[model samples]
Target: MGSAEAWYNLGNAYYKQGDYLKAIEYYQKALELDPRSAEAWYNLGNAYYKQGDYLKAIEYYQKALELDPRSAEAWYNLGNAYYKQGDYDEAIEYYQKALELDPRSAEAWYNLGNAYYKQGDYDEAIEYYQKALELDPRSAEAWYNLGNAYYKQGDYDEAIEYYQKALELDPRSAEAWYNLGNAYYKQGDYDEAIEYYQKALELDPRSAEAWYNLGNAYYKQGDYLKAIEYYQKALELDPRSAEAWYNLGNAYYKQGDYLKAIEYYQKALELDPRSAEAK
Candidate 1:
């Protein structure tokens, strides 16, 4: 008893079992029996999407749309495939179609925000992220991205507030903590910046940028010894960081150690011939 629905049901079960190879074979069987099966085509596209073949996924998604033009899932997935291909304009168009079919999809709204953010349209990204948040208030990723939009716009105050909200929901996010520290640094609050950077370091100890920025905060507070310690730590993590070497030279010069200052200066100059300031 060979049946198309049975094959499709088997495909769905395999997909649920994380066996997309089996899912694809059964879905292909379903489509062979029912050439106009939009659901089978959509699921075939899903299997290819999971396999990271975006162009193949797009072809199947387009086929499903041609057979059933009202499929919100197909439209959304086509949008995602285009996004993976770096086709933001096409992604935006497909996401809009999906949203028109299903306006309550918070995921579509969030993806639209990400599309706009990749295009460097911070204002539009902010509005889309806000729309996503209205639909799914518990989305910490949306909150973090909302802060990023504000941060890119140079609105440190707004960025700080949103980042704080993100941290409240997910405290283990090192990127969020680091970004919050950068926002405080922009606000010239060294102590506040230091606190957040330390938190980030506690979660991710090997981040050279965090170490460098922590040293910058200490340097701003005129603690040359503390600054040197952090800069040395950063250099050990990333030996090619000419900026860190230059900063180490500056710290030693401030500490009245000309010999140590010149040694570090030469290291910076060796890495970057354009480090004229080191001379």
Candidate 2:
């Protein structure tokens, strides 16, 4: 006799194949036959999560947890829901609870680190990220987050090392390349910083922040002309960037072009009149 288990297996097969609509349909059929199936509910939540429907995912996860309160997967999924809702504190609480149940869950550790980082608890974030790395040495997300924690603490050397580790695991990671550039810049290595920033631009040309930071790197290196060029590019992409205008003025001042400097300074003041530095 065919049962709900058969329907659940069909849902799993669809989910694995990226057919989320079919997956949800079969999962619904399974749940209709067995409303208290925590596994079915959890699997259905996964499909909704893939669709970026955190609210629907949370609904299913809560239903699953109502049936099995101690399910660590449900708690972890709840944590993801809280994270998406920008409730970092609640997310941390649920992630910690999940970790208590599944101590070896690297993803839970990584998510907990994210929650701590959002709360400005870099040390706590680093600790959890380290645990995640211990659980999965090749966890690019953990290494990348660890690098951000280190960078926030002004530990540029450690940030660079961790960013490199992340990149070694995923070379095409735009964030890893961008953050590595930040580390190099923090250490006052402008040339190396520019190299990485250029790489970031090559990977994603529409990144205004990358162009802005690249201008800063050139300005730091005493290349006022190149700095102005990059600054212009940044301003072109994001006209409202007050810092870009101010930095462009600084580059012009370095080149002894007071007229151009004054012009850019006026633009900066127009964007942010209270900028004492621009004044």
Among all candidates shown, the one with the greatest lDDT = 1
- Can you write out model 2's per-residue Cα lDDT over 1-279, one digit (the tens) per residue? 148889999999988888899999999999899988889999988899888888889899888888988878788888888798788989899888888888898888888888999999888888888888998998777788888899999999988988898988988877577889989988758888888998999998889889888988977787778889988898889988777667778777778865568799989778776645554
What tens digits encode model 1's per-residue C-alpha lDDT throughout 1-279? Answer: 258999999999999989899999999989989978888999999999998888889899989999999967888888999899899988998899989989888899999999999989989998888999998989999999999999999999999999999999999898789999999998868899989999999999899889889999988897888888988999989988767667798888887864577799988768777646545
User: Candidate 1 clash total?
Assistant: 0
The 10-residue segment of model 1 with minimum total lDDT is 270-279
Q: What TM-score goes with each of the models?
A: 0.87, 0.80
> Which portions of model 2 show Cα errors greater than 4 Å?
257-279
List the global CA lDDT of all models.
0.90, 0.86
lDDT of the structure predicted as candidate 1: 0.90
Q: Residue 20 of model 1: what lDDT?
A: 97
Angstrom error of the Cα, residue 181, model 2: value is 2.5
Best by TM-score: 1
